[PDB]
Design a protein around this nucleic acid. Structure first.
Lengths: 73, 73, 73, 73, 73, 73
DNA sequence: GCGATATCGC
DNA sequence: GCGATATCGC
DNA sequence: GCGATATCGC
DNA sequence: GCGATATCGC
DNA sequence: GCGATATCGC
DNA sequence: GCGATATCGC
DNA sequence: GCGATATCGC
DNA sequence: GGCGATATCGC
DNA sequence: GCGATATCGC
DNA sequence: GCGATATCGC
């Protein structure tokens, strides 16, 4: 029916959960500097357990669904 | 001293634990045929979570060890 | 898991490679009758020579393992 | 020290108690046929409780003695 | 500068001399489909020698530059 | 039909063409010495192009001959 | 691994 | 043959 | 004991 | 290319 | 395999 | 003394 | 457009 | 993980 | 539990 | 070889 949207990356899923915090600690931070700081906070991250787990799962499904679009659909 | 070796893949990790069952199910199977079977099973596997989790922590560890190597040469 | 699993019998190694034949020959088959069918086919076979030869090779690999386990802790 | 032999079975216990009887009811019996006639009488036997209960204690003692030889190895 | 970058593979060195030709032969083809089509056209080429030669001259020099770097600057 | 033997490597080809010359230069040389001296005349060999070209053709031919064997029985 | 006759060694 | 044996078939 | 092939995965 | 794993050819 | 150098049974 | 096997690093 | 990462063949 | 081409999805 | 063979005791 | 119970894949 509809080419399944690409799944979210690990950094994307993390950034989602941590955007509000980065905006709170940096009042009036513009659009680009959030990504920048998010990037920096990511590169300096110690335990990326949850976010590499999910992004791999989300990919597995996406790959199964991509098959599905070419199978049925 | 030695630069860290590349981290083990989700598949490489699963296979280390599943090698002997493949040998058990196909007596006298050649290494080549064991790999192709290892592949056949990996591609059929619905739940890869365990192996993707271990793979992830493996790449964390690894990238630590890589920083420490660049850092202290 | 440390204790080496018993090797697969000639019947088992055959069954492992007739499961989809039986299933295809018996559409809509209760997951018990498929087992009894294998028994009926295993008995009704004649050239059991392939699967006997293969299950001997299992014992060979298996013997080494048990002996290697019981000795090397 | 020596690991225990497996417990005797209701059948095997009865037989021990009922061997010399079969022998007398069938003088100069060939041990081949004692085994057979033993079977016949065992399958015909409607009250097996003596031997199941004797068998149960036999199991219970063997489980007990199995437990206490994993300790004092 | 620092690290010598890995040399270009034989298919890779040929692709760089056929990319334009493919992009012409299929209007509106994307890198995904290009790379795919590259295969089907390489896994079919006759006198592969020119590209194999260059790849090895490349490999030889890379090896003779990864030695220099891990020795000097 | 016999299986095509695996193709010769660039070193294997050079060494073959160079055993004679090595012998002339180290009279009475033992087989394990020739191995060791073939090892270091190679590493020192700055221009390996000829023997890399030959190893490549051998591979192309061999690859296409495998395509023959494993298709035309 | 036991209870019969079937090998065995002197 | 009589005592120590491999073997027999459940 | 080196330099590959052979088969998967990254 | 690297990894893992065995074997081939010399 | 590559082959110099021993070994071993005729 | 002469064929047939055994060895060793890469 | 930045920007972390993903796609493809090897 | 490394390459050499973009091509995404999230602001 | 259920299908098969494998194993232990006698 | 017989009964019984173990083990293994579904």
């Amino acid at each position: 029916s509809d080419k399944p949207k690409r799944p979210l990356s690990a950094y994307a899923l993390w950034l989602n959960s941590a955007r509000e915090s980065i905006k709170r600690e940096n009042p009036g931070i513009k659009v680009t500097e959030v990504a920048k700081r998010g990037g920096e906070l990511w590169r300096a991250m110690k335990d990326k357990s949850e976010w590499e787990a999910k992004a791999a799962k989300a990919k597995d499904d996406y790959d199964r669904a991509v098959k599905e679009f070419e199978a049925n659909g």
